[PDB]
């Protein structure tokens, strides 16, 4: 049993939108994840499939270190997916997928996270939004997210 939306605490959440989630460990920052699926378990609890975002300081580098966030708003997308309870959502947030050619939006205009990289968890490396390393479906996912960001931000101030 799958759902296209789910309502909790007075807020309705659709598919393919970023949300903040209460972290597993208390000391962690609130997790950020894209909603990919809304399902109901056998026992009736509602779980959402989420595609994680990785903060540059927590994403492991191959060399064993961590990345330096260029901007406070920087997040790494990924393909790491996990089923988390629907009651764990805090609220919907804003995440902007802006390609390398276009420059970032201004902070006071549109506040929220910005994504310029995608974190490869297997090889522990970063992929650009458009890259030959992607498979067809993963490049399609990244293109869908970039397009959804573009329908919001019309102007493309190039560097």
């Amino acid at each position: 049993t799958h759902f296209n939306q789910f309502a909790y605490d007075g807020n309705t959440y659709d598919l393919e939108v970023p949300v903040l989630l209460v972290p597993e460990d208390k000391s962690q920052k609130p997790y950020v994840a894209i909603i990919k699926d809304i399902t109901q378990t056998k026992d009736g609890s509602m779980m959402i499939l989420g595609q994680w975002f990785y903060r540059p300081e927590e994403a492991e580098k191959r060399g064993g270190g961590n990345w330096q966030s260029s901007d406070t708003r920087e997040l790494f997308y990924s393909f790491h997916r996990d089923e988390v309870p629907a009651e764990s959502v805090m609220h919907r947030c804003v995440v902007y997928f802006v390609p390398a050619h276009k420059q970032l939006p201004k902070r006071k205009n549109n506040p929220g996270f910005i994504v310029r990289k995608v974190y490869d968890t297997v090889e522990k490396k970063l992929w650009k939004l458009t890259d030959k390393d992607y498979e067809d479906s993963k490049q399609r996912e990244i293109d869908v997210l970039v397009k959804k960001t573009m329908n919001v931000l019309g102007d493309l101030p190039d560097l």
């Binding site: 209460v22 994680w52 790491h80 996990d82 988390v84 309870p85 764990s88 968890t121 297997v122």
Partner: peptide, 12 residues
Amino acid sequence: TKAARKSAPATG
């Protein structure tokens, strides 16, 4: 308000 747990995937 349950919490969300992140799995640890197999990496290189």
